[PDB]
C-alpha cells in the first residue's frame, strides 16, 4: 500500500555552549513524540530552540527562546537542567526546562509560523550535506574546548579549596599545567588541548586525594 506519514522535516534542538546546535528530536521522527535530556549549567539558563541540520547554532532557524531565572548550580556539579521537547498530534512543539535542584520550571509553545518552509527545508538539507566536514570539525573543537574549559575551572576550584593542604611542588606543577591548557584552549588544535588536559591530570593526583578527603 501507499500512505502519507507525519514526521518532523528537520532536526529540533537547543543551542549549547560554544554556539552548537544540540539535537533533542532527530530529523524524520514520527509525531506525536516526546524527548528529554538533562544539561549542565554554564551561567545564564537560556533555552534557545533551533530547527535544522547544521552544527553551528547560527546556521539553523531560531524557533524561540526563554530563560530559566534564579538557578543555583546543583551540588557536586551534577547536571541539572532537564529540557523536554513534546510534539503533539497536531504537530505543535512544546519546549520546557526544569531545574531538578529547585523544581523551577518554564515553558514555551512554539508557533508553526516560526518554522522553515518547504523550499527552505530542502535548502537546509542541501547546505548540511555541502558542509558536513566543516560542521563536524567545528563541533569537535567546541566539544574539546568545553571539556578543557571545565577541567581548567574545576581544577582551579580544587586548588583554592585545597589551600595550604596542597604541597608547594604540586602547586607549581599544577599552575604550569593550567597555563599550558589555557594556551591550548585559545588555539584550534584539538589534539593539543587533549594532550594538555592529560598532562594536567597527571600532576593532579595529590590534588585528587585532597578533594576526596
Annotation: CATH topology of 1-132: Substrate Binding Domain Of DNAk; Chain A, domain 1 (2.60.34)
Q: Is the peptide bond before 56 cis (omega within 30 degrees of 0)?
A: no
SS3 114: helix
Rounded distance between C-alpha atoms, residue 55 and residue 31, angstroms: 24
SS3 32: coil
SS3 39: strand
* Residue 198 C-alpha from the chain's centroid: 22
Asked if 203 contacts 166 with a C-beta cutoff of 8 angstroms, the reply is no
Domain boundaries of the chain, sorted by first residue: 1-132, 133-213
Rounded distance between C-alpha atoms, residue 40 and residue 211, angstroms: 21
Residues belonging to the chain: 213
Phi, psi of 180 (to 5 degrees): -60, -40
What residues are paired with 50 via a beta bridge? 13, 62
Rounded distance between C-alpha atoms, residue 13 and residue 31, angstroms: 16
Experimental method: X-ray
What strands lie across the sheet with 45-51, from one edge to the other? 20-25, 12-16, 45-51, 61-68
Residue 25 vs residues 36, 78, 134, 201: alpha-carbon distances, Å: 9, 23, 22, 35
**Helix locations, 97-167, DSSP H:** 118-130, 132-162
Asked if 98 contacts 81 with a C-beta cutoff of 8 angstroms, the reply is yes
Rounded distance between C-alpha atoms, residue 116 and residue 108, angstroms: 18
- Choose which CATH entry (1.20.1270.10, 1.20.1090.10, 1.20.140.10, 3.40.50.620) describes domain 133-213: 1.20.1270.10
Asked if 94 contacts 108 with a C-beta cutoff of 8 angstroms, the reply is yes
Tell me, in Å, the resolution of the deposited structure. 1.6
Q: Locate cell 530529523: which residue?
A: 27
Cβ contacts of residue 201 below 8 Å, gap of 6+?
151
Rg (CA), the chain: 21
Rounded distance between C-alpha atoms, residue 135 and residue 129, angstroms: 10
Amino acid at each position: 500500500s501507499v500512505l502519507l506519514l507525519d514526521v518532523t522535516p528537520l532536526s529540533l534542538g537547543i543551542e549549547t555552549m560554544g554556539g552548537v546546535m544540540t539535537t533533542l528530536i532527530a530529523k524524520n521522527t514520527t509525531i506525536p513524540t516526546k524527548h528529554s535530556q538533562v544539561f549542565s549549567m554554564g551561567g545564564a539558563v537560556t533555552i534557545h530552540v533551533l530547527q535544522g541540520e547544521r552544527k553551528r547554532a547560527a546556521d539553523n532557524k531560531s524557533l524561540g527562546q526563554f530563560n530559566l531565572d534564579g538557578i543555583n548550580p546543583a551540588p557536586r556539579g551534577m547536571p541539572q537542567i532537564e529540557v523536554t521537547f513534546d510534539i503533539d498530534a497536531d504537530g505543535i512543539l512544546h519546549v520546557s526546562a526544569k531545574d531538578k535542584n529547585s523544581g523551577k520550571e518554564q515553558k514555551i509553545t512554539i508557533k508553526a509560523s516560526s518554522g522553515l518552509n518547504e523550499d527552505e527545508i530542502q535548502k537546509m538539507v542541501r547546505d548540511a550535506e555541502a558542509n558536513a566536514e566543516a560542521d563536524r570539525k567545528f563541533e569537535e573543537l567546541v566539544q574539546t574546548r568545553n571539556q578543557g574549559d571545565h577541567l581548567l575551572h574545576s581544577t582551579r576550584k580544587q586548588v583554592e579549596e585545597a589551600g595550604d593542604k596542597l604541597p608547594a611542588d604540586d602547586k607549581t606543577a599544577i599552575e604550569s599545567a593550567l597555563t599550558a591548557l589555557e594556551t591550548a584552549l585559545k588555539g584550534e588544535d584539538k589534539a593539543a588541548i587533549e594532550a594538555k588536559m592529560q598532562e594536567l591530570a597527571q600532576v593532579s593526583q595529590k590534588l585528587m586525594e585532597i578533594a576526596q578527603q
